[PDB]
C-alpha cells in the first residue's frame, strides 16, 4: 500500500462512519458474516496523545457484537499499529479510505448514502492492490447492526 494521506489531521476524522465498501486480498477474509476482516466501523475517537480508538461491530458466535480497539500512533501520521492501519485518503466531511495489512481496505462515509465519488476513489486506490473480494452495502443495510 503506497497511497497514504499527506497532512492527515487525525483529530478531524473523529465521529460517526459507515463501512460503505470493503475489499481484501483473500476471499476468506470477507466472504462470511463471521469472516475475520468483516468489521463494521461505528465511530473513530482520536486521543489527545494522537492514538485512535475504534468502535466497530463484528459477527461472532451467531450474533452482532460491540467491539473496541486502540490503534497506536507511529512516527507517520497516516499509519497506526494494532498489524498496520494506513489512512489512504479523506476529506474529513464525507469519506475516508483505509487499509489494514494479507490486506483489507474500506471506504468509510459519514452518512448512510451510496457515495459514487468515494467508491470511484476507493476502486482507483485498489486498482494497484491485489484484491480478490469486494463488498458494498445499500442504505438499508448501513442502518442495521452488522449490515444485516
Ligand atoms: C481510519 C481508521 C479506520 C481503521 C479501522 C480499523 C478497524 C479495526 C479492525 C479490528 C480488528 C479485528 C479484531 C477482531 O474482532 O478480532
For the chain, give every domain's residue range.
1-148
Fold of the domain built from segment(s) 1-148: Lipocalin (2.40.128)
Which residue's alpha carbon is at the smallest distance from atom 15 of ligand 1?
A: 58
| Number of residues assigned to the chain | 148
Q: What radius of gyration, in Å, describes the C-alpha atoms of the chain? A: 14
Resolution in A: 2.1
C-alpha cell at 119: 467508491
Ligand 1 atom closest to Cα of residue 58: 15
Residue of 18, 85, 90 best suited for mutating to test ligand 1, as the one with most atoms within 8 Å of CB: 85
Ligand 1 atom closest to Cα of residue 60: 15
Amino acid at each position: 500500500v503506497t497511497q497514504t494521506m499527506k497532512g492527515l489531521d487525525i483529530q478531524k476524522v473523529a465521529g460517526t462512519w459507515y463501512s460503505l465498501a470493503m475489499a481484501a486480498s483473500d476471499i476468506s477474509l470477507l466472504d462470511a458474516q463471521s469472516a475475520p476482516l468483516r468489521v463494521y466501523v461505528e465511530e473513530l475517537k482520536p486521543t489527545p496523545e494522537g492514538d485512535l480508538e475504534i468502535l466497530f461491530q463484528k459477527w461472532e458466535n451467531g450474533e452482532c457484537a460491540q467491539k473496541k480497539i486502540i490503534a497506536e500512533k507511529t512516527k507517520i501520521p497516516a499509519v497506526f499499529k494494532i498489524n498496520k492501519v494506513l489512512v489512504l485518503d479523506t476529506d474529513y466531511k464525507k469519506y475516508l479510505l483505509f487499509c489494514m495489512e494479507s490486506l483489507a481496505c474500506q471506504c468509510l462515509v459519514r452518512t448512510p448514502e451510496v457515495d459514487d465519488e468515494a467508491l470511484e476513489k476507493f476502486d482507483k486506490a485498489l486498482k494497484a492492490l491485489p484484491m480478490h473480494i469486494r463488498l458494498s452495502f445499500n442504505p438499508t443495510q448501513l442502518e442495521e447492526q452488522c449490515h444485516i
